[PDB]
Amino acid sequence: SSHKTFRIKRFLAKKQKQNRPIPQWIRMKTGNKIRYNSKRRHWRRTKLGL
Amino acid sequence: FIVDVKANKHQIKQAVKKLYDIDVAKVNTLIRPDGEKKAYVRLAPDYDALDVANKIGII
Amino acid sequence: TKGTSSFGKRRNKTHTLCRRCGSKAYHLQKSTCGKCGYPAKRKRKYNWSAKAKRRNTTGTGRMRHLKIVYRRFRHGFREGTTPKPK
Amino acid sequence: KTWRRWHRRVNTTQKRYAICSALAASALPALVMSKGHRIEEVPELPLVVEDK
Amino acid sequence: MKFNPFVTSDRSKNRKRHFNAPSHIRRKIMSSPLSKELRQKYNVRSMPIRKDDEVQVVRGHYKGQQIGKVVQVYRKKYVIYIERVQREKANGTTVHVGIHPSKVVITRLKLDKDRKKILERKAKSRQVGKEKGK
Amino acid sequence: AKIKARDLRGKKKEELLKQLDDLKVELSQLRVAKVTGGAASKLSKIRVVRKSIARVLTVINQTQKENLRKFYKGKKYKPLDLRPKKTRAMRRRLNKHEESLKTKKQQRKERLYPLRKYAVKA
């Protein structure tokens, strides 16, 4: 909005940190079932806890 | 710098002075959209920033 | 007009993040939740939504105090002692 | 359901009658052999032994 | 049979117990027999295998009478790597092939103090049981 | 290189602080070095220094709190920290002496009419 509270800004920050894709060294771990992050949120489609 | 989010400019100023034996003109904080309070810290004109920068490691 | 054009003017919000339960259900005008009833001293739970009841029972969260109490009890609520040292 | 009638209760004489019937045919080599038991070389069929 | 009414004899329970076993418990699981030679000497059937014992592989492809030194113990993978027990990958690089500890025999132990005290404890219990049986 | 709990126990209070400070300094430089690449060899230390820092701080708090409960062991009113936390309810049980207070009437009863060990058929 460009007029944020601090509460909201911090919320957004964490959401922004969560988006990154898996580190590829994770795929090489021993008992690995994970191939892709599957919790990736694109701003244009799917619109936050808000 | 990156600074702890709870800090006042007063605290930062006092920290910067304490750690690096330095002295500050002014501190000028903001908050990164990421979460880490950044701090621009103007040193007083008796001091050169590149000289301290070399002391602390960065360049 | 009742539909698509009127979805146009959903410019402003009813609820926000409640600060007890965390849900986006704190109604700003009422200044209550409607999930935990925030200002209300006691938590809101109802016996009709057994599914809702289960979604934030105890187990659910960290149980950061309660999980070490269970351990403490097990071995006997001993306090202020150590094992025999080396 | 759990309260399906699982257990089944039998008259006591009848239970005894069965147990007498089984004993009586633990004699009878035919009935023992037919029940599969290789009892070919055993010396006597109601096989009783010392009590050491 | 097992009569103790607090043990389990339940496939799912035993396997879960096994695969989700914690390091120190895996140490015990990953044990391996002594050579008849040592079996005579120490009065011990078998020992928890360790980083640099000398060892024969008894079964498999690498089954052989050579005595390779242990290389590492991958307790996560329930396996030990052994000196010349290895295979050339596509691009020439050698790769230490895993052998399960139980399909191996310890010819030479790596004796530290603690390993010494372990062997003293196992031998003593064995001889107590022989005295009780006699 | 290794900072153990072992040795720190005996050390003087001012000496423990200097050590913490000197680790806090060493942590700073590694954090600086993590930004500027540094080297894997440096970026190990950062974990080590952190835990040694904790090892120091821990020893200090254990020493401060041991001394503190020496100081109150005897006094009736003592800080809530130093009072024994068991479980809310368990800190409202009857006192251990208070729940075996017999009424004089009940005591007299136990004196006059004690349950006797007896058997039958002889």
Next chain:
Amino acid sequence: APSRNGMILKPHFHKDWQRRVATWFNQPARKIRRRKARQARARRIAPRPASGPLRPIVRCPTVRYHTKVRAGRGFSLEELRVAGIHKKVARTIGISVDPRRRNKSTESLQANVQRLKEYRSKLVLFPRKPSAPKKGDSSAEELKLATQLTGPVMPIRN
């Protein structure tokens, strides 16, 4: 709808009864638990009868039962008074005492005095300390039995 002959019968399954069905899969586990707990209680009350205390003989009420006789709840005060056992003590030697029992007929009274008399004969009161004062029996009748009495103590047989 009823079809040609049968009891015009009323079952009571109109409430939500399946919400209150009470299964009995316990019962074996229960039966054991009682039994352990029973054997423990014996062992605690070491030479004392496992039974409990001695209890009076008593006739049932009503024309129906009338002829039969059970164990009652406890011996009346008159019965203790006549036997000559102090009521407060009688509890301490394993004699049940109720005090709410009247005593109408003298045939039921003298029988119940006789009971207590007989009890007091065949009772082995141990002394408080191993050093032996009055009342407490001889070490002969003590060594020869610190034995429990299995079953109800001096059982009533109609």
Next chain:
Amino acid sequence: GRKRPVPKGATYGKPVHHGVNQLKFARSLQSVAEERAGRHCGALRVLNSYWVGEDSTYKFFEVILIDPFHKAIRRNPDTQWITKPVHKHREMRGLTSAGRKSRGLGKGHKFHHTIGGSRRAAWRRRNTLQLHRYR
């Protein structure tokens, strides 16, 4: 008495339940009195109450309360039963002399409902299909 809290009349339902005016609470006023004294002084543990008068509009009562954690109560053995945590909120559970009376329990033919612990418990006993193993 107790008028039925429903808007206007509008106890929508079968005209058995249409009543709103002439109907009467289960507990007594004296119990309500205790319950309120109990509510207010949470630490305090309601022992018992008595009557001190009545206007048309009000009744008056006098609820005896006790600190369970005052040493003089704690150390006196004859009272120290109230300091036990089963006796928290007697009045709320229907356990003072007053609130006992509504429960409808006494020995003898004039009761039977409440021939287990309480009214609810007897119903419970009487409406259990005991379903035995062998039947």
Next chain:
RNA sequence: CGACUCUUAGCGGUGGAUCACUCGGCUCGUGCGUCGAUGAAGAACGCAGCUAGCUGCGAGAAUUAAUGUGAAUUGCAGGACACAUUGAUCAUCGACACUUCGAACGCACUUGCGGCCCCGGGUUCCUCCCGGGGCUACGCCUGUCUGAGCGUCGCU
């Protein structure tokens, strides 16, 4: 023969049935039967050398101490350590620690405004200013201090 269409079979696709597995459920039983103002449950936000999620933890943050264990952890790095030494790694967990909301407590929910005591810079108690620390919810009981009343008396 030609193309196309139909039928059958071979082989290949599409698709994921079947079968075989099962660190999950469902049911019955046993023992115990323990949360919280000494701050619960729950929520939030944090914390990894490279880590997003799940988990684990709390600015001592994938954990500190202690005790038991006795060489690993391991996706890769890097390292430590002398694994003839309180000693890697797990387990236990009694010592220590435990950010912010939350019954939730200085008053407010902006994360805004405060009061009162002490400490360091600031002064040289000059109050300011900055930083740190400790108090500052409501209700209620036992006492304590200060009181109020043409409430009931006494002496003056």
Next chain:
RNA sequence: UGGAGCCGCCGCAGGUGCAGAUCUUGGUGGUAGUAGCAAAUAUUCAAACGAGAACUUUGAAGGCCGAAGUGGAGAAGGGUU
């Protein structure tokens, strides 16, 4: 073909045999390379990059929005665009 368990007989037990329920869940056709990719006048030439250009970029031309704008800035909302 497949690659790890499975069956006959005598008894017992059952969540035991499908074509349909505008049945449920999943999959696949014909329809079909069909309908369709038509609101608001407009594109053209050369070059560059490049494996590759109707669509990118640069230059040149021709056009439109025509300051109640297809321009220049905010509010709310989004939340890194």
Next chain:
RNA sequence: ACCCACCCGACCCGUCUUGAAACACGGACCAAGGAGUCUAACACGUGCGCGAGUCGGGGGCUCGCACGAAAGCCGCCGUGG
């Protein structure tokens, strides 16, 4: 039993209906799923045991239950039905 030919026969199933190939509804195709269960009470029939009796519950005595939460036994054997 695969394909083709020819002669004769031959309307599409399910269903409700007096009457369905119907211009009556459901049904593009395939896979898997999918509906007379269990408890209680009664009655009659049948099988077994005992028989003017019969009965087993409930309880108890025998075990840490590996198989047992079985099996066995009870002046409780009959309070009682």
Next chain:
RNA sequence: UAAGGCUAAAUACCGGCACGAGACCGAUAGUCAACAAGUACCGUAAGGGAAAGUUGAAAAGAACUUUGAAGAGAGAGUUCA
């Protein structure tokens, strides 16, 4: 013998901690959930709520040569496959 009070035990236990078992289910079943599930996702909100198990004994997961901008191939190799 009411209008005052306390009291263990046999009794209950689809929540909790910790175990044991099964003539149960075997991935459209069994819990919504065998998996980063009360997750993703939807809804202003109360609330709603999925799908999704399996290379192999071992990663030995295809070095190298060659065609192509590449995805894709052709040979070669690993594997008992």
Next chain:
RNA sequence: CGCGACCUCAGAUCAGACGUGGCGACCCGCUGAAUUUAAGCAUAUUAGUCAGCGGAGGAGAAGAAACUAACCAGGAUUCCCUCAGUAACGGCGAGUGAACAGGGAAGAGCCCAGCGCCGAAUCCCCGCCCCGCGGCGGGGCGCGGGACAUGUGGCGUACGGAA
């Protein structure tokens, strides 16, 4: 126009304590439907059942007769078997529906007020010493405070009790 008793009331960031929310399978107190059945429906039934509110404990509640009975009498409470689908209720329709006895599981009984006697013989908090201190207790010593005669403590409570 004072000073002093008490009574009733305030205020303290006064000293020291407690209560607040959670969980909710089981438990205690209230509150309380309507689908439904009756082949319609209104009483009845569904049901003192779901939802609603309150408060607990490891269990809760109950409990030591203002009881049963009508016998040659039993003798607190809870639980099971039975009583019994019985007595009874009921548009006497649908439907509903206990208790005593009897046999078991268990078994345990007690205390006040009052009435009276006893120099309040009682209690709480201070402060000093010795022990003990991670369930704040013992013993001693203080003209150290207060509660209390508008009644604390010992004896005693119907099974009788006192002298």
